[PDB]
Amino acid sequence: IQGFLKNEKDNALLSAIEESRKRTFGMAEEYHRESMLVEWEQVKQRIL
Amino acid sequence: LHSFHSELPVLSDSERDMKKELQLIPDQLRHLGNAIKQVTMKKDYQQQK
Amino acid sequence: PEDVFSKLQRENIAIIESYGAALMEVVCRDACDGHEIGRMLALALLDRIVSVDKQQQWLLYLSNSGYLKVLVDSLVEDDRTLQSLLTPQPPLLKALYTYESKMAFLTRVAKIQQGALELLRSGVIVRLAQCQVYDMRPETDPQSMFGMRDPPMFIPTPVDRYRQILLPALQLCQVILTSSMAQHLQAAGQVLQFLISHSDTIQAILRCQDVSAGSLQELALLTGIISKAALPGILSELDVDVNEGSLMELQGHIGRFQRQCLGLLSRFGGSDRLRQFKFQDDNVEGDKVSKKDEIELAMQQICANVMEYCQSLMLQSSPTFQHAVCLFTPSLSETVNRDGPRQDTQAPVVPYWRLPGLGIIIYLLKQSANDFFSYYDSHRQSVSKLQNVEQLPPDEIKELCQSVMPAGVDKISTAQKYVLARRRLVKVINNRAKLLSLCSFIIETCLFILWRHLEYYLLHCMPTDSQDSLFASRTLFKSRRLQDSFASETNLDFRSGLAIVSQHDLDQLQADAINAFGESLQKKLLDIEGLYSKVRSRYSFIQALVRRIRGLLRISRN
Amino acid sequence: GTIYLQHADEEREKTYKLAENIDAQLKRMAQDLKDIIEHLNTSGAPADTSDP
Amino acid sequence: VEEAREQNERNRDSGYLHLLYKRPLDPKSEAQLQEIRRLHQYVKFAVQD
Amino acid sequence: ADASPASAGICRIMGDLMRTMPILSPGNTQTLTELELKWQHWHEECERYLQDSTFATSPHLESLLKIMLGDEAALLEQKELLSNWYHFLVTRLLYSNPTVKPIDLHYYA
């Protein structure tokens, strides 16, 4: 029991770290794209 | 090839960063040459023994 | 109405607010100074507070207390450990995990414009430009492709540990250049200095012949970093003692990044993207589908970021249309020479010192105006599957499950499998929507860059056969020595790197553009504006460019 | 014939003379090591081919 | 002879001199430094062995 | 320059070279390699005025240019203006090595 109730607790700490990191890193591409698209959404007004 | 390189008017960054490294090695060579002396005096001692 | 997830985060952040500076010390100090796992969890905890704080109370604590700089100057002591984790057998991955959470917290702070400015005020880009681990790139052996078939070990490769180090650092630069809007030229100056502190490593990314999801992700960050910091106006707006030599090296690096990024439009915006996929769609079956959504995505990300950079150059280079920078030569041949099948004589790799033809932009315009119709009905099917998950075949529910968990799928519950299926179908829907938004931009920007080259070459380009020019040159390149005194503009004239344009190249560009922009393409572009641009404020923008190109393509020189 | 010595050339020769002295001292330390090793391996070799 | 011939023509370009600040080591000065590093490491290991 | 309208023009070339010298400023976000590459231009500009013979009308200003170029002979011609060897050391570091490190310093001392 003390092996099993360690291994899944160390797995659980790592999973709470994992989604924090990866959901902020994928939001970095999504934040680049939406700022990239919104500055293009200025440039097209200036053009037209 | 050594006279076609002596006529450059200023030191490069890499000629200064080589000098910074070349100025370090004399103090490691002291400790390394002392380690040769230490091992030779160890050999001299074992051989005399 | 407010959803319960909008409510519960307000009341939880009002509880966390209520403990004040004592709770802020207890977490921020432990993020700087605590145990291996203490710093790690406290940095993911700060990432999570800063994802519900709307007042910026935690940012203003983190800055004024000093902790936001301690969590930046420590990167130069993290480097020393991360270099060890690139060895074939790393001693403990713990330090990579604390770095990935430190870097996630920075990549959270940097999405608030004031937080990104406070990171340029600590100097985070200059500390990243002090970490040697980004130049510790492992050598990827091409002979290894006969070396066994090995299991998914609990320790990643050195090449992918290098990705877990590099990709967070690239994403922070990219995020700072997208929260720091077009005012703060110092942000772009710092990120340009980081790309030059790693200069031939950055070019070795731009020269990587790998087509993995990883090499395309390395390129899809790097091109999207290059698009906003390799810009001309930054070189007029960096007023400091800089020596004439270091400034000409800075131009010598920008004039390396520009030309090597243009070399990706011929690789992937060009005719041999249709070669690259066959080396993936042929050999290795068990992982093809899961990774092809990412490789198709990252390819169009790299296309969009270089079209963003070309667009930026065609907006900064002059306000006056007569002094617009051309980046694409009058050759449209790159659209013509394929309608007849012959054997694979090695195509001679285009020297990345050469400017691409304008035919690559018409080829890219044509191809995203095909890819968009694949992606549109793919998204519309993936949404239909997300609307009907419990009706899917039990073997397709298993393909979706194995696309997330490559083991253990025959050991999980029916609800667990339906939840995996919903969560893969959302990843596919969002990757495919992300792809439509990329094809949308690349179509509109292909039409912008095409309009601007066509407006220049017809109306403002003089063919070099004009013999009156025989009086314009012969008097500067003869030796004098010494004396004296200052006061003119040293301008290095990049117009000496342009192509010799004949009137035949202008006649050819006209004859070819008239056919290569034929109304079969013009209809499809208006059919796409009929489907997609109803979602955006500027319906008729594609029509306005297609109209101005149709106007130019009807002018005759007389 | 016609050049004045610049301070950079004097510093460059002073850097390359430092490298020459260290190359010549390292090759000597290495020959001293090789002579010590040669002696360590010859002392192991008993001279009498009359031994069966 | 061709290495020396090309080197001799480059030394006359008034545009070359301003770039020299950022020049790497020449491929003999870097090679003598690579040999000094190799010899130092050998002399360090052989003293231990 | 106020008293001597014959030297004043040359005294102001010397004086403006005494304003272009790249000295480090504690409030200023530069690298050592920026200070170094600036100071190398300033040295290549000071020596240029010596080749031009610009100061060979007042030997005091010709000495000040050699001192400002790190000339170890002209600095020792100033020994009756250097009351101790450690001021001579710091002068020699200011005009011959502005990127000196603790781990170089023994040799200069």
Side-chain angles (χ1 to χ4, degrees), chain C residues 526-546:
Chain C
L526 296 171
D527 302 307
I528 292 170
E529 182 157 67
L531 290 157
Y532 199 72
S533 304
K534 284 161 191 179
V535 191
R536 298 187 173 178
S537 41
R538 299 181 181 80
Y539 185 79
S540 95
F541 183 69
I542 290 170
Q543 195 177 135
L545 293 178
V546 173

Side-chain angles (χ1 to χ4, degrees), chain C residues 244-245 249, chain E residues 18-19 22:
Chain C
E244 285 176 68
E249 278 235 86
Chain E
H18 201 49
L19 268 127
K22 282 263 184 184

Side-chain angles (χ1 to χ4, degrees), chain C residues 98-160:
Chain C
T98 321
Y99 171 86
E100 285 176 297
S101 68
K102 189 177 289 188
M103 291 305 276
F105 160 73
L106 296 171
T107 295
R108 186 79 70 165
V109 171
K111 293 190 180 91
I112 293 176
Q113 178 178 20
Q114 191 66 14
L117 290 169
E118 235 67 43
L119 287 173
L120 292 167
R121 287 175 165 181
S122 54
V124 73
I125 316 299
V126 190
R127 298 308 195 185
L128 294 168
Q130 286 160 10
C131 301
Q132 289 168 326
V133 70
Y134 309 125
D135 303 307
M136 291 293 290
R137 189 174 181 107
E139 295 195 303
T140 44
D141 172 35
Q143 307 202 69
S144 66
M145 303 183 71
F146 289 91
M148 302 292 101
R149 194 168 179 207
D150 294 344
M153 296 292 283
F154 187 82
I155 299 175
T157 80
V159 180
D160 311 307

Side-chain angles (χ1 to χ4, degrees), chain C residues 243-246 248-249 477, chain E residues 13 15 18-19 21-23:
Chain C
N243 302 294
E244 285 176 68
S246 49
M248 192 176 151
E249 278 235 86
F477 267 110
Chain E
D13 184 349
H18 201 49
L19 268 127
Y21 286 87
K22 282 263 184 184
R23 196 190 166 171

